[PDB]
Amino acid sequence: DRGVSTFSPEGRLFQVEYSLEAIKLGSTAIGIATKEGVVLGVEKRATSPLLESDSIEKIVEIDRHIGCAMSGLTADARSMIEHARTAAVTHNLYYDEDINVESLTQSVCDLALRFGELMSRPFGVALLIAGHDADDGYQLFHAEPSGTFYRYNAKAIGSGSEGAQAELLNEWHSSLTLKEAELLVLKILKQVMEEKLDENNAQLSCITKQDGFKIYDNEKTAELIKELKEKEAAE
Amino acid sequence: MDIILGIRVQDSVILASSKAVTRGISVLKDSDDKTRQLSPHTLMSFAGEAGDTVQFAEYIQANIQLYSIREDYELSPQAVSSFVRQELAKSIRSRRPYQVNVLIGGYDKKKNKPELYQIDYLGTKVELPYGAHGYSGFYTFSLLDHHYRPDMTTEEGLDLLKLCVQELEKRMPMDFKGVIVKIVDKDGIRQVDDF
Amino acid sequence: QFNPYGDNGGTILGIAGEDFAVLAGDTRNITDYSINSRYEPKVFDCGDNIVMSANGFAADGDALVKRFKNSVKWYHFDHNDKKLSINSAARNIQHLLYGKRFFPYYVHTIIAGLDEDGKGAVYSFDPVGSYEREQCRAGGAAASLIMPFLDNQVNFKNQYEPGTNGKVKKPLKYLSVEEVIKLVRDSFTSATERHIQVGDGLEILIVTKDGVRKEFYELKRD
Amino acid sequence: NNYDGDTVTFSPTGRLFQVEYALEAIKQGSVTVGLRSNTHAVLVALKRNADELSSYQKKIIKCDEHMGLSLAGLAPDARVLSNYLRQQCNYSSLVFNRKLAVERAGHLLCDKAQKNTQSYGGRPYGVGLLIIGYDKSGAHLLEFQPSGNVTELYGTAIGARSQGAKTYLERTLDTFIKIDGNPDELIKAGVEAISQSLRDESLTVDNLSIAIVGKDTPFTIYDGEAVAKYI
Amino acid sequence: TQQPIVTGTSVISMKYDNGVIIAADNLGSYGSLLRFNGVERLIPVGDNTVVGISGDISDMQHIERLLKDLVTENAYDNPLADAEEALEPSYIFEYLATVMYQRRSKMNPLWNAIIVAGVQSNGDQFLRYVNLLGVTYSSPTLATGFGAHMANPLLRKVVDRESDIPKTTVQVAEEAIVNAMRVLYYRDARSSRNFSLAIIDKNTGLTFKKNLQVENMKWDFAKDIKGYGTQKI
Amino acid sequence: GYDRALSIFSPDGHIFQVEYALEAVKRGTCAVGVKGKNCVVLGCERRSTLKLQDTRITPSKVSKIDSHVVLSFSGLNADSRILIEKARVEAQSHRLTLEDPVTVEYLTRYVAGVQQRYTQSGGVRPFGVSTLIAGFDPRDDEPKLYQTEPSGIYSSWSAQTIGRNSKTVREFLEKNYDRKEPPATVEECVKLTVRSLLEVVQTGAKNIEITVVKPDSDIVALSSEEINQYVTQIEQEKQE
Amino acid sequence: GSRRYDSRTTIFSPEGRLYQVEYALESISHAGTAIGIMASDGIVLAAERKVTSTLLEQDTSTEKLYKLNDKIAVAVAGLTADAEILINTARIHAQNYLKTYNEDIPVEILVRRLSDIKQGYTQHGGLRPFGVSFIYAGYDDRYGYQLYTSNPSGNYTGWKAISVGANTSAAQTLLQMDYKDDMKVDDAIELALKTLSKTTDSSALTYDRLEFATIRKGANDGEVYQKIFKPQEIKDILVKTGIT
Amino acid sequence: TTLAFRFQGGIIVAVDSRATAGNWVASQTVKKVIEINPFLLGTMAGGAADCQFWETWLGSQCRLHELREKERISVAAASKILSNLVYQYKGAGLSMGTMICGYTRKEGPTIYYVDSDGTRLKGDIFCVGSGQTFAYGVLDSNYKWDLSVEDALYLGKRSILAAAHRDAYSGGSVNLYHVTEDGWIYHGNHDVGELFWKVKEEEGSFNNVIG
Ligand SMILES: *C(=O)[C@H]1NC[C@@](C)(O)[C@](O)([C@H](CC2CCCCC2)NC(=O)[C@H](Cc2ccc(OC)cc2)NC(=O)[C@H](COCc2ccccc2)NC(=O)CN2CCN(C(=O)OC(C)(C)C)CC2)O[C@@H]1C
């Protein structure tokens, strides 16, 4: 055995690089950013059909203008969400305004690397943080346990991510409507999901400037799934 | 706060507590319950410094409820009283002591005995046939010394209490807006709905 | 026994126009019956088109302004060079003041600037962080002399429309920067005549969307 | 090999492997160039994107009105060190009404990085920094390395293929050292330097990050449309 | 919370066309007892700054130690310690102001009134005051204790506003200072005849004069004063 | 104090101490929860290489957290007592501050949060325990059943099992539980619970424990006699 | 640093066992046998001494049987010194309860707190567990006569008859065979000795290798007496049951 | 002067708009009602800073509750956060007289009185502040459970006007709120400057004053 804060000969932190492996084993999460809003979708992956799928909370509200989807050891995400919510409400208490999406992400990532011999290990979960602010409009951020965060027009994390990202790379253009982006997330999820996509084993959400972060109930998502098959069958 | 009384009769403990809550020259409320059920067969009435009274009662209530759940068993009134005394005895040498006086009325199911405990904010405990905190005692102790009999029924106990409230409404300078009365017996705790 | 507080006198005054705002202060600094300085500025450009004065105990005033200027500098760093709106500044200063609730900053604080709609804004604070937005406010030694004059001449209080039999009020309307400066110069010359801690110099900071301009005027030195 | 398990262990040849592995993270980092005249100091950084759909990582951070740095390696480590430097620049201001000398900034970074290289359970910083500033003694460029070694230079470069730009600046020395009272010319000589470290790719408009500080120039960062002028 | 024990009285100072002058007497009082008669209360810091201190002497001796330690720390890893990175009067003042305000805020003041006199590297006159409360102010004339009551009115007749500074020579300004020290000796019961005076000039640098004496005192009229009203002899 | 990171990542991205904590759950006596239309039933295996057991005084495998919430578990008995104590304390603390008993989801989320904290704190090993938490939210008639495991993940289950041969009894529940039609009565629900345990248990002698929780803090532990009837009724309905 | 020398006393094996708990139990399996038998009218505690020397002071010694309060006693199997740390803790804990509630501590509550301390040493702090198993014999007004055991794992269970230390597998077979529920204390005494007589690794069971204690109602009407037997009192009981 | 009362048509909340610095009138146009959420109101009386700081803080704690529980906080829970906070500061010299007024489905329309002594009372009628006794006098002698929304709004307005007149430390304007099952509805600012003369004339009251 050997220290938790040790560098590899290649110049990477062992414990960080190993956490990245744990995230690859996670259920899929996809986000897409447009001028009409940001869409967040996830694979629920119920381990058994006795488990009540609606109790699988992998898309989570941080504030009215900031939502968050997770992939990996999802229990590790609880304290990250708790910190993010406190940081957003606290900012609003100190400054009578909405926290910037980047500033909230930077706050979450400042937790990431405070482990060692502070918490005992890095987080084994990646986050897609999606939101809107007046300064830089609609934004999607990938927040890793390295303490790094990237902004993306679209991003996939979890098991199906290499396949999903190559799919997003072609499909994304700068004038996607919110509708198109919803269908695109549904389409790419059904491709990389082991079992067959329905309103019970996959969940959609968006954040708009007008109506903030909303999780879609299974009725609305079931209609987008029915809509998706009609576009596909008709080419 | 001000008025809290207790009479232990043959088969019950009766707690009478004033309904008035006053700040300055305003009666803010005239229907205040100065009582918490600690366990199904144990009731605590309280009087003293604003805020401290409720905070103390509810803290004690939480601790007795926790003990009940943990041991699936109800603490004897003697045990609850000793716990409460020790908490007050601790508080009095604290940074800011709890300024709360309490009566504990309980029915011990093992002995089949009603028990009344009077405890002041210093943690001074006594077991009493009848008790009072504050100015009330200056009228009620001598009155009960004369009229109280050890073998009285619950109905006689309530009549003895009417005497006490009548006397306090006659001679006390402040309007305490009547009392809420509660009986603790072998069947638990009930409140008399008009007095 | 050691008294941690003192009174450095002086008086401050803020007024909000439609598309401008002023924060005026006398440049006199006193303790007891002595003049420390005839020109010690106590109205400061704090960046992001916010001007601030903390009048009263000078030491506590300088401490607060320093901490706010520092607060603005870190807001830029921590929030990608974003402009600190006057409302957000106001709320920040509440927290600065309320931090020392049990050993307060002995100052009356006024900030002036433009709100996020480009309108003139004035916020004023008690020593322990209470605050409210208002069209105008005076602070410090001569507050009690100047404030009722501002109520009358800025908000047209107790003024009625001639020959309406006291039923139609004089109509509230925004003042020109030229008119606001007349009221400020007259507020201070009146304050100087009647208050011993007010005099020497008047310094005015005017805030428009084009930035912070400064005007200065001699006052009676007695 | 057997002596690389922690920062508190010397190798038989007297090396600290955890520090050398830290130094390795910089080598893997995207290239950044620093260079200075007598009047101005410029940072040019190549920003690296995750893929075609991602933002380009910020390389340059402002520390005060007169001081800033560029990073190569672990970005969070740069955030910690830059935050520490912001605080030291602040402290100098509030307490002494004194803008912090770039030389003292260098010494303070060195001593902060050093503590981590001598104590158990810690780790060396995994980032290299180029610090530019204009203080009371003119324009300065500093090279920081997580070993604790800080170096004052006319110019340098760190990160991937940095050797190219570092040789060019060594050749150009006498030209750029005298671009005095010309901002645009020092920037273009910086852009020319970084171009020696490019392969199978050249400078685009959201690829390139430039910072300048000088006599009558606050430390300011040019990104996106405001660097099109310089490609 | 303290009470001052051994104390020094007025420090007085003013700006002139090129530099600043500062002066203070050499007495350490112990209440009404004029206990110590060789106490330097002007402490020079480099060749561009003099710090004049009044109030508690034990606290003054602490501040001396802080300043000589500051010059040391500034020289550390500083090749330009005697050049562009030398201590400025404004640096030294802001440090003392910071300490004074922290100590009052801990309810444990340094029981002193301080004037920092000097010339900045850019040739600008520096003159600023700080006291036990952390209160700070600048003026063309500054003084502490009785100085504020009796010295300022006389010095302000020479330099009344900013525009008077270019018109004031070091001859005129030093004359005003020496005269003001004589008045304080007449009228301050905690003052002494022996004083130090320092000129910081942007051309001639730091001139420090020790063992000055108040001279040309008017006392002769005393012989004509008999009794307290009606007494003739 | 003792500082070591005991729970850390391996190259394959696993945390072996969490995974080995799940092995302790696997080795624990079986436990099943089944929620009816109007009730939840908790059923627990009791390992049978012990007679001279004094079951008057031996810790019961189902624990009341509040008067409306019960918790059962599989894994290390000692570890379980620590979770139960914290849960009981948090139950009373919620009543004191929110003036309302905990929802079952809230109590689960708290216990799950404790287990998770012990996966990334220095000087501690994870809890060798998975829990079934069952009951009724205050003034709510909809039945609740949640599972927690050493990692700290939790979720809601129509019915679920944990411990040794849980794979065997989950198999049974998966084909014997209709989502569209829960056991409509207490009677029906207890039967499906005992049936599921009889795949794995042995004789249903001193071998099966059942607790029934109904709305409004109505929890009753079944006794040998009552259980034994369900056992004899199940076995004489078997002869096909 | 120091990590290199850390045994990690609080980790799981790949099979989800606590190494140090398992090895502590292995340690306890070599300790003198202790037996608890609970009758309807009292409890017996019998324990076998780690082979005595002819020169050990027999009467003044207490290796095995310790008084926790007036109503509760423990038999010890394992490291004596470890047991004494836990016993002084249990004695204090009983006195804290009496001080707080003015009532003698219920037997289970005391047992649960000692078991919770043991548990702690297996989950945090990176120390070795206590190499001790206890048989608790006690009486309270709620459950009457009670027997419990606790072991290094911090697990505790209630018993009608139980053994700890050496040859428990043998002892538990003989107890399971001859124990009846109606049994009186005098029969339980005889059972305890007959059981040690057969499972002992010695040639013969003699008074000077035995610690013996009863908790009866054998004083004055509904009040409980603890008896720690003197050498002579054991020697007499050894003859009356016919083992010498 | 602040007041809140329960009636058939929900809750009426009425406050004055004056801030004082001893006998100096600091402001005539100050907000004494904090809108915590669309179904929750807080009234402020006492220390201006103490009230503003801790009641906006209460709004932060109420937002966090609905994030972690996906449900609006109960009036009981919201009041008990503020009462448990001030109780921690007891003896430090906080000065706060607050009413937490709101509607939740489980509670119905609820008013809690909370003060800096740590007193927390559920009740149907409260008046808090220097001018409480003046407000009580008018409110108590005209109050029925069956007041129409229109009448109850006026009584609330008239009770604050009463206090504004007699109490030297109350005045400026009346700010009115109505709380229903659908949440709070603002019923406007009413300057005493105009309201007094209009009420005198239309009601025929205030015959103590030179008309
Ligand atoms: C109805 O009954 C009505 N009565 C009127 C009134 C004014 O009493 C009030 O309670 C208002 C309501 C608040 C208005 C602002 C919105 C929030 C509600 N209360 C005030 O206006 C208070 C009055 C008050 C109350 C209690 C106090 O106990 C100390 C003091 C004062 N006003 C202020 O607090 C006042 C506001 O600003 C005044 C001001 C302005 C400019 C310069 C100086 C002052 N400020 C202060 O009192 C400042 N003071 C600071 C020092 N301090 C203190 O405690 O210091 C130490 C040293 C002791 C620590 C206390 C506060 O509304 C009701 C409903």
Ligand SMILES: [Mg+2]
């Ligand atoms: Mg004047």
